[PDB]
Design a protein around this ligand. Structure first.
Ligand code: CL
Ligand code: NI
Lengths: 211, 4
């Protein structure tokens, strides 16, 4: 049926979503999972939201990513309006009009990370690693745990993803190209890619490797 | 939630 999580709300606001859920027999939970059908975001007047994990796992799963205005309006009009009509256009980083969630809902047959082996390497922040990994699998990539366990051959295309911020070492991520043969890039490659639901030419994200 |  319908199962919701919310992102960016206040308790007051959450309470309104709850009232909504009660009226319409919609399930409402704290954590996002496979079953989650909807992701309710705090947006501005033009449905521009912030980027949060739920936001990403939302698009990645092709869930409904809908502005909080879906709720209040539905309450205000004593009935449940169309998700179609309140969907989030974009975000405060990737643009007000990119229609990410849209694409997704209609691309579950060709996922942006078809034929990719991704290895999320090293420490991350604000986002547990297994979640970033879950993210990329939802997009069709294949997760790999250790640099040395990329699937050699040609069949596939490997990629190492790092978040430089969270490192406590001097010269050590400039030198991944020593222990494997994959392009290296920042998390922003994935997040950006998932936001837009477009595969971002590695170009802008590559990290330079000590020969 | 953290934002990015
Ligand atoms: Cl937050
Ligand atoms: Ni190729």
């Amino acid at each position: 049926r319908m199962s919701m999580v919310v992102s960016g709300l206040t308790p007051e606001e959450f309470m309104l979503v709850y009232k909504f859920a009660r009226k319409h027999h919609i399930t409402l939970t704290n954590l996002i999972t496979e079953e989650t059908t909807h992701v309710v975001m705090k947006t501005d007047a033009e449905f521009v939201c912030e980027r949060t994990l739920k936001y990403f796992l939302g698009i990645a799963g092709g869930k409904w990513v809908v502005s909080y205005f879906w709720v209040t309006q539905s309450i205000k009009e004593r009935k449940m309006l169309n998700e179609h009509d309140f969907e989030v256009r974009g975000d405060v980083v990737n643009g007000r009009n990119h229609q990410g969630p849209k694409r997704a809902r209609e691309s579950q047959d060709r996922k942006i990370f078809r034929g990719l082996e991704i290895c999320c390497y090293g420490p991350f922040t604000n986002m547990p690693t297994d979640q970033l990994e879950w993210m990329v699998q939802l997009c069709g990539a294949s997760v790999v745990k250790e640099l040395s366990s990329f699937t050699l051959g040609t069949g596939v295309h490997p990629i190492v993803v790092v978040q430089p911020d969270a490192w406590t070492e001097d010269n050590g991520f400039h030198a991944i190209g020593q222990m494997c043969e994959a392009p290296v890039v920042t998390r922003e490659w994935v997040l950006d890619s998932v936001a837009l639901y477009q595969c971002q030419e590695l170009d802008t994200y590559l990290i330079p490797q000590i020969p | 939630s953290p934002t990015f």
